[PDB]
């Protein structure tokens, strides 16, 4: 018959979310409660009712007693898991109480950047039993699992936390137990507002002010340099994300600014060609369309993306 | 009844404060004095009264004698704690004297950048007992805890150090002992003065000198390029800090320079529009307002932030 | 006679492909099935039919029993192999079932950048037996080897996976067993399209718009600065790749833009030299060739590379 | 009575000096000679007169024999000390010969950047006895301590090496032994000459050549851009050093170039204001002062810093 | 008498050459054959003639039998040596066969950048015996030592590999054995050709095209900005190398472009001063010298360095 293994996972800290590598790092405590009647013991008066063991000697005790422990893996773990504590408390009954304090990076494969920077992401930790459900069954250790209240993350804000149990078939034919700690997080837009939206909007607004100088050459030089600035912002954005196979809301926003700036160069080349061919009066009359086109083009663009993505 | 565990923590070095990741790194010595009568021993004349042990064999001795050690965790630790020394001296009485020399990063979750770079921050190390207060009670080891006199930090300056004891309920239902080493540090502003204030002030002051050329086009070109430089400083500042969800004193300062520069472009476009419409005499008379507005706008802005933040 | 060693390798995650260092990193599970009759055991009723061991004690058991284990090496491994699990299950029969869960970087020496960014690459993991084929023979553990379906890689897309067995002669005179897990991957061009092709095409197209202004000096200034932008893109590309001893498709593409831009400066210098020598009418007539040359030169260049590389 | 512990430290390599973090890294060999009569042994003919032990088993032998070893700490060490060799050779007499080969970073708290880049710095390694002087006394192991002849450091040049013994009171009430290996190193100025002095001098000299064009507007544009270049060099310099609370010779040098460039903008604004107000003859006569002021200002500045710092 | 220790070292991979830190990283296999008659053993018929050991238990066996192993050090090693395999096979005779598979960085102190990028460098691995030549003598294990055929290095090309034996006196009075694996490597110039020579040559050639416009002011502006580009290339080059105390061929090349560009500014200032003083005809006649000087100056410079360095 199978023995119930009580799994509990609590994230104390978010040491960082690295969206370029699609992983996240936490400081966490894993807690297990497992009753093995074979490990039960008798004690003399004065002698303790609870035996405390370093994992090393407790595993060495299990091998001796020919007992199989609920060997588990953090399925989505990455690199080195640095351990703080690996302590066992064994009661007279045979109840094993295990605590595992660690720092570790975990794969974040649920990353969907299509709406970046207005995106919401799913982050999880998968705890799998190496042995199948006929031997060990994972149960939810109540009153422990979740996320702490001093996570240390400033950009991300955790919207909800969940725990559930499911099956996996990684090393076995038959179903094997899997404990899941899941959390959803959305982004604080302040960085994007201050470093990307406000600057891009300023460059566009103060560039439009110069249309009132009525110097077509000067607009051409301005739109040309503006195009270079947007290409530079395009590199600034791309450095935050992985080399995705798909278009971002931000990517569509930058391609939009490229198109409008390209047309600004084209139109003002045409108005200055009119001036060069002794048609200054005509270019000046058409200039009202060029001056009111600019704000309408960027405002039409903003409504196009907002529709295309929402 | 509970046994008194004497905790002492001394920070020898500050290997660095990383404000982008909100953590700090220290070289420290942890000192514990714990009397366990069960560990007492007899000795013959001439034979030593003090037994020296490597943690490995001392823990192996505790497991043998069925003794529970005051298992502790550095609650706010991050990653790998690289150890230099883990040495035990056991007296005939049963007094365990433990020394733990390490290099380690700790979470700095008390980071408040709202007044950056004129900010004061709290840094701490939390030492928690895994076992509750009915088993072990942490006491303050006197004459040891604090911060050394060659910390190696150049930007930060420690204002005060404190040690105290409190309860925690991390793994238990009932209260458990927690030792706290806290320190407050303020920043040396010289870097910000030399690399950010002086340059930004120079760009503004030498740009104002060119107002005396009375060339409105030249002011427009200068304010436009100045706006680009401020956007670049905006990125230089943002790279020092995390992607905060809130506004910095520095952020307000940069947004301010954007607004004033935006208006400088707008005003000088208007003066040059006057010159283009055969109203050069009028633009020249108004120019006194444009020339005296510039210094007043930046000086009014500086007094607005200084009021809004203090 | 030689004993069959059943090798199985499964890649769960691609933590990254680093093309500058020509290596890749995976999270993988190694599975071995090996029957050693010498390890067989008798059991009493109630006592388990399968003994579970930590690698440490199982190797200690092999040394005791004077048994030689199929010692292996990951031939193309690099640096530290961080291990998650190293577990042995020994059946009454003497069937050793070994599981090795790890994170590791592996050399990618098959890297051919000649067609970058339209390149397809071979990535493999080599598992070698230290002892020759007279002692141990590697066999393919069926229904396990391959690559998972949540690899976490965004730029690369795996086209096919293969497993095969071959000989090696690394430490021995005679042939020794080698297990091979191979995979082919092609690149998602979206990053190159969005950050390199679209910008380079825009700079070229909007620069051509200005030819309609008929200002030869302005074209010279524009082509000069365009040349600097392409040199900057040249550095942006070179930072992604190693310092190769051969020419890339991308390198040929950039050298092409340098040549065309060089000639644009040369031609427009000539047209402006005509204007300076009172031959404005002649320069204006020739200008049709200069205006239609530009698009044809870049379109002729694109067909030249596309032929020279395909 | 106290036993003499012979300490010897030899630095084979300087893996790097990181002045931003104020630390340095070495590959070194620690050598200890300690006679413990209790460890003495008898040997049979043919049996060795010197017993060789891995530190692990030698410490295990000391615990058994109830002997206290001279437990030491590298006081100024930082992070992980990677070990190559930890070997003990025990003679029939009881003379312990210990060798410790390691790679490690050490705190450099003696860093004085006030004269950078013409600075000389003190680097040391502190080896402390955990037990006081009544138990163990450190002595200087003769003919071993120092620095090798293939250190691998290219920027720094070691001027002298010293060894001495002093007391410390880190974990004890009474004085405890401390071994010191100290070295002084000065900087090779070639990098600063080639990448900072020559460029800054060229920008200044070739900018002065343009004064002979007698175009005041052109000088204003040149000095404005020069000011931006110096702000960029200011960032290039600041990236090499920590965020110091004090002024560098280099910082004074850059602030100087800012002031002179600021005045160049101011003066040439004035000369062009004269030209604009029909006083070109006056501006042209005063221009001799503006042309000879420039070289004298930078040469007067250089003599001011050279006095203020030496 | 001394026992022959057969050393063999094979480099499988070059994980990288870091010329800024003057070190290199390899994946290598160390092989030792050492006959110790004391380790010989008896076996019954059917029982194995070869005993296979994990280094841990084999060293524990040597300590037990009171045998001294040929303790060695990788003299030029740096940081952590990550081990893949540490396996011993002991024959009935007492022949120890040891295999050490590792990833490690080694100091490269033979680095001579004086002719960079046309430089050839020496790279080596030093394997030293801790015990002197009276105890152990290193011999060359034949048919193993060298470098593999899938090194994975793209920039460097290995010209030759050598193995030899020499003495060292690191920890002893008398000579001690040292095994040497040496290799020479030259650089693939393609990176330098594509990213540094072609761009610098283009900037120079297309800048010369504009001399045919006969606008002295425009040449001054072009040479001024060219000087800034060369200062930027000067930083791009310096970032690849350590902060050397000597001049590079590349450094001489950049200082040369600074001088020629400085003179271009000077000459064209003079020609424009002639035009300003109503001597346009004279400046136009002298212009032939200025136009033909430019190509001759750079071609004379290139022949000067090529002579000064070869
Ligand atoms: C930059 C946006 C500011 C808009 C107001 C117009 C004033 C001029 C701004 O400077 C100019 O900006 C161009 C575009 O970035 C560059 O091509 C050019 O070299 C630079 O002189
Ligand atoms: C910029 C701070 C220095 C002010 C002194 C005035 C002289 C000219 C300095 O160069 C200016 O640089 C800006 C930024 O690139 C350009 O927008 C602008 O057109 C250009 O004239
Ligand atoms: C950037 C190409 C955009 C084409 C639109 C034409 C308007 C001018 C764009 O600014 C150009 O930017 C270069 C940056 O290097 C300068 O060298 C060049 O003198 C300047 O005129
Ligand atoms: C620039 C140092 C070399 C001086 C030699 C005189 C020729 C002109 C150099 O081009 C300068 O480039 C700056 C870029 O920042 C601009 O701001 C400035 O207006 C422009 O004149
Ligand atoms: C860049 C080399 C190309 C040579 C052909 C001349 C076309 C103009 C290229 O733009 C130039 O950029 C320089 C660097 O910023 C400025 O100094 C210069 O005054 C400006 O005109």
**CB neighbours of C73 closer than 8 A, spacing ≥ 6?**
C127, C128, C130, C170, E84, E85, E101
Please give the span between the terminal C-alpha atoms of chain C, in angstroms, as a whole number.
Answer: 52
CB pairs under 8 A between D and E: 127
Helices C216-238 & C198-209 angle (0-180, nearest 10): 170
Number of C-beta neighbours around residue D248 at 10 A: 21
Q: How far apart are CA B242 and CA B248, in angstroms?
A: 11
Residue A236 carries which DSSP code?
H
Residues of B in contact with D75 (CB under 8 A): 12
d(Cα D134, Cα A151) in Å, to the nearest integer?
A: 48
Instruction: State how beta strands D146-147 and D77-91 pair.
Output: unpaired
Domain residue limits, chain D: 1-188, 189-310
Distance in angstroms (rounded) separating the CA atoms of residues C170 and C128: 9
Q: Name the residue facing C266 among E82, E157, E209 (closest C-beta).
A: E209
* Calpha distance A194→B241 (Å, rounded): 13
Ligand nearest to the CA of C217: 5
Ligand nearest to the CA of E208: 5
**DSSP β-bridge partners for residue B168:** B176
| Rg (chain C; Cα; Å) | 31
Sign of CA pseudo-dihedral B150, B151, B153, B159: negative
Bond preceding residue D23 cis, omega within 30 of 0: no
Inter-helix orientation angle E249-276/E280-309, to 10°: 170
Q: Chain D: residue nearest E263 by CA?
A: D206
3-state helix, strand, coil in chain C (%, to 5): 40, 35, 25
- What is the per-residue DSSP string for B87-106? EEEEETT-EEEEEEEEEEEE
Nearest CA, atom 1, ligand 3: A224
Q: Tell me if C266 sits within 8 A of E210, measured CB to CB.
A: no
- The total number of residues shown for chain E amounts to 310
Backbone angles phi, psi at A194, to 5 degrees: -70, -35
Name subunits touching A (3+ CB pairs < 8 A).
B, C
Contact check, Cβ <8 Å, B242/A53: no
3-class SS letters over chain D:
CCEEEEEEEEEEEEEEEECCCCEEEEEEEEEEEEECHHHCCCCCCCCCCEEEEEHHHHHHHHHHCCCCCCCEEECCEEEEEEEEEEEEEEECCCEEEEEEEEEEEEECCCCCCCCCCCCEEEEEEEEEECCCCCCEEEEECCCCCEECCCCCCCCEEEEEEEEEEEEECCCCCCCEEEEEEEEEEEECCHHHHHHHHHHHHHHHHHHHHHHHHCCHHHHHHHHHHHHHHHHHHHHHHHCCCCCCCCCCHHHHHHHHHHHHHHHHHHHHHHHHHHHHCCCHHHHHHHHHHHHHHHHHHHHHHHHHHHHHHC
Interface test with D, best of B44, B185, B199 (most D CBs within 10 A): B199
- C107, β-bridge pairs: C23
The whole-angstrom separation of Cα C184 and Cα E160 is: 33
Strand, helix or coil for residue A231: helix
Rounded to 5 degrees, φ, ψ at C261 are -60, -35
Which ligand is located closest to the Cα atom of residue C218?
3
Binding site as annotated, residues of A: 43, 92
E86 reaches C (C-beta below 8 A):
no
**For B101, phi and psi rounded to 5 degrees?**
-100, 125
Distance of CA E14 to the CA centre of its chain: 11
The vertex-C82 CA angle with C81 and C87, nearest 5°, equals 100
Cβ atoms A47, C44 nearer than 8 A: no
Q: Which of residues 14-53 of E touch D (CB under 8 A)?
A: 21-23
Which residue of A lies nearest to C43 if distances are taken between CA atoms? A66
* C241 phi-psi bin (left φ>0, alpha ψ -120 to 50, beta other): beta
Q: Does A190 touch chain B (CB under 8 A)?
A: yes
Q: Where are the alpha helices (DSSP H) in chain B?
A: 55-64, 190-192, 198-209, 216-238, 249-276, 280-309
Q: Which helix (H) or strand (E) holds E238?
A: helix E216-238
* Residue in A closest to C17 by C-alpha: A21
**CB atoms closer than 10 angstroms to residue E278:** 8
Task: Return the closest-CA partner of residue B240 out of B253, B226, B251, B230.
Answer: B251
Nearest CB neighbour to B227, from listed A84, A195, A206 = A206
Which residues make Cβ contacts (< 8 Å) with residue A265, sequence separation at least 6? A220, A223, A224, A227, C206, C209, C210
| Residue E228 beta carbon below 6 angstroms from any ligand 4 atom | yes
Q: What CA–CA distance (Å, rounded) separates B166 from B137? A: 10
Partners of residue D212 in chain E, C-beta under 8 Å: 269-270, 273
3-state secondary structure of A300: helix
Q: How far is the CA of B228 from the centre of ligand 4 (A)?
A: 18
Cβ atoms of residues E191 and E285 within 8 Å:
no
Strand pairing of E95-107 and D136-140?
unpaired
Q: How far is CA A260 from the centre of its chain?
A: 32
Query: Which among A84, A195, A198 has CB closest to B77?
Result: A84
- The CB of A225 under 6 Å from ligand 3? The reply is yes
Any ligand 3 atom below 6 A from CB of A264: no
* Paired strand residues for C28: C11, C102
3-class secondary structure, C187: strand
Q: Do the Cβ atoms of D226 and D281 come closer than 8 Å?
A: no
d(CA B212, CA B214): 5
Question: Quick check: helix, strand or coil at residue A105?
Answer: strand
Do A147 and A8 form a contact (C-beta atoms < 8 A)? no
| CA–CA separation, E187 and B18 (whole Å) | 38
| Integer Cα distance of C87 and E57 in angstroms | 20
Q: Are C163 and C181 in contact (CB under 8 A)?
A: yes
Among E24, E105, E143, E154, which would you mutate to test the C interface (most chain C Cβ atoms within 10 Å of its Cβ)?
A: E154
- Whether D222 is in the pocket of ligand 4, judged by its Cβ within 6 Å, is yes
Residues in chain A, how many?
Answer: 310
How remote is the CA of residue A117 from the centroid of ligand 1, in Å? 28
- Report the distance separating Cα B181 and Cα E214, nearest Å: 74
CB contact under 8 A, A107 and C50: no
CA dihedral D276, D281, D283, D286 (to 10 degrees): -170
Contacts of B186 (CB under 8 A, 6+ apart): B119, B120, B121, B156, B157, B159
Q: How far apart are CA A85 and CA A31, in angstroms?
A: 11
**Atom 13 (ligand 4): residue with closest C-alpha?**
D225
Of the candidates C153, C232, C233, which has an alpha carbon nearest to the alpha carbon of residue C195?
C233
Task: Tell me the residue length of chain D.
Answer: 310
Contacts of E172 (CB under 8 A, 6+ apart): E131, E132
Contact B77, B103 (CB under 8 A): no
Nearest-Cα distance to chain D for B175, in Å, is 31
Cβ–ligand 3 distance for A221 under 6 Å, the answer yes
A210 Cα: distance to centroid of ligand 5 (angstroms): 25
Measured between alpha carbons, how far apart are the two ends of chain B, in Å?
A: 52
Cβ pair A203, A226 in contact under 8 A: yes
Instruction: Provide the CB-side half-sphere exposure for D96 (13 A, CA).
Output: 30
d(CA A66, CA A69): 10
Give the Å distances, CA to CA, from E260 to D207, E198, E266.
15, 18, 10
* Triad E145, E148, E149: Cα angle to 5°: 150
Residue C246 touches chain E, beta carbons under 8 Å: yes
Q: A34, A89 in Cβ contact below 8 A? A: no
CB-CB: which of D53, D191, D214 is closest to E276? D214
Q: Taking each helix axis as running N to C, give the angle between helix B249-276 and helix A198-209, from 0 to 180 degrees, rounded to the nearest 10.
A: 10
Cα angle C291, C296, C302 (rounded to 5 degrees) comes to 145
> What are the E-state strand segments in E108-155?
120-129, 136-140, 146-147
CA proximity to D207, closest of E225, E289, E206: E225
- Report resolution (Å) to 1 decimal: 2.3
Q: How far apart are the first and last CA of chain A?
A: 52
Nearest to E157 by CA among C241, C245, C114: C245
Rounded (5°) CA angle E267-E270-E276: 145
Phi and psi angles of residue D168, each rounded to the nearest 5 degrees, phi first? -145, 160
Distance C224 CA to ligand 5 centre (A): 5
For residue A162, how many other CB atoms are within 10 A of its CB? 13
Q: By the 8 A CB rule, do E162 and E221 touch?
A: no
Strand (E) or helix (H) holding A79: strand A77-91
Residue with CA nearest ligand 2 atom 14:
B225
Cα distance from N-terminal residue to C-terminal residue, chain E: 53
DSSP assignment of C9-41: EEEEEEEEEETTTTEEEEEEEEEEEEE-GGG--
């Amino acid at each position: 018959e199978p023995s119930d293994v009580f799994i509990g996972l609590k994230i104390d800290q978010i040491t960082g979310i690295n969206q370029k590598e699609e992983n996240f790092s936490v400081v966490g405590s894993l807690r297990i409660d497992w009753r093995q009647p074979l490990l039960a013991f008798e004690h003399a008066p004065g002698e303790p009712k609870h035996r405390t063991y370093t994992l090393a000697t407790f595993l060495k005790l299990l091998e001796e007693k020919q007992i199989r422990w609920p060997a588990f893996t953090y399925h989505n773990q990455q690199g080195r898991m640095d351990f703080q504590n690996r302590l066992i408390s064994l009661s007279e009954d045979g109840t094993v109480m295990y605590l595992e304090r660690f720092t570790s990076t975990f794969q974040a494969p649920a990353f969907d950047f299509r709406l970046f920077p207005f995106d919401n992401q799913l982050f999880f930790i998968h705890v799998d039993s190496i042995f199948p459900q006929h031997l060990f069954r994972f149960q939810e250790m109540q009153g422990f699992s979740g996320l702490g209240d001093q996570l240390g993350e400033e950009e991300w804000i955790v919207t909800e936390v969940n725990t559930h149990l499911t099956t996996h078939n990684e090393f076995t034919k038959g179903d094997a137990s899997r404990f899941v700690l899941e959390f959803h997080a959305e982004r604080h837009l302040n960085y994007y507002l201050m470093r990307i939206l406000i600057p891009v909007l300023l460059i566009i607004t103060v560039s439009w002010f110069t249309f009132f100088l009525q110097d077509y050459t000067k607009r051409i030089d301005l739109a040309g340099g503006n195009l270079l600035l947007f290409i530079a912002f395009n590199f600034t954005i791309s450095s935050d994300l992985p080399r995705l196979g798909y278009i971002t809301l931000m990517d569509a926003f930058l391609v939009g600014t490229f198109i409008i700036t390209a047309l600004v160069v084209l139109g003002n080349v045409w108005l200055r060609r009119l001036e060069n061919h002794g048609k200054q009066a005509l270019a000046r009359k058409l200039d009202i369309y060029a001056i009111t086109s600019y704000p309408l083009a960027y405002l039409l663009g903003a409504l196009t993306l907002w529709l295309l993505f929402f």
